Amino acid sequence: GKIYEQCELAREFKRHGMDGYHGYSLGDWVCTAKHESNFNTAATNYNRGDQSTDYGILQINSRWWCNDGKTPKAKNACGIECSELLKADITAAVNCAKRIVRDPNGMGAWVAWTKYCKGKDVSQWIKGCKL
């Protein structure tokens, strides 16, 4: 895996048109990744409540979104192996994030976005980054 530089991640999000995607900004996405994974693709989190695990830089869940082969009542809506979300390349995570965000909840799917980023000045996350 890899730990992204803050501005490196912003540039990757922009590369993928996350930039204004469904009304959300680069700052929103970078703010979320900070709070979810500390910018680390190797990040994982176990959830006792439903035996699921959150994977990678946007902490994508094994119940609904990716397949990890070990979660009960799983759906794999993104059509991706969770383990691939742990590698340095974040395109799969981004593609899946675009799918998630299209649901009615939007970026609300990330509780950490609503807590730390929603309705705040998120432009500081990208200030000084050359984009």
Q: Domain segments of the chain: what residues?
A: 1-131
Fold observed for domain 1-131: Lysozyme (1.10.530)
Does an H or E element contain 9, and which?
A: helix 6-15
Catalytic residue list: 36, 54
Distance CA 53, CA 57 (A): 13
Distance CA 108, CA 104 (A): 9
Distance CA 37, CA 16 (A): 19
Collapsing DSSP states into helix, strand and coil, what is residue 46? strand
Distance CA 69, CA 101 (A): 24
Which two structure tokens, joined as six digits, stand for 92?
A: 């799969």
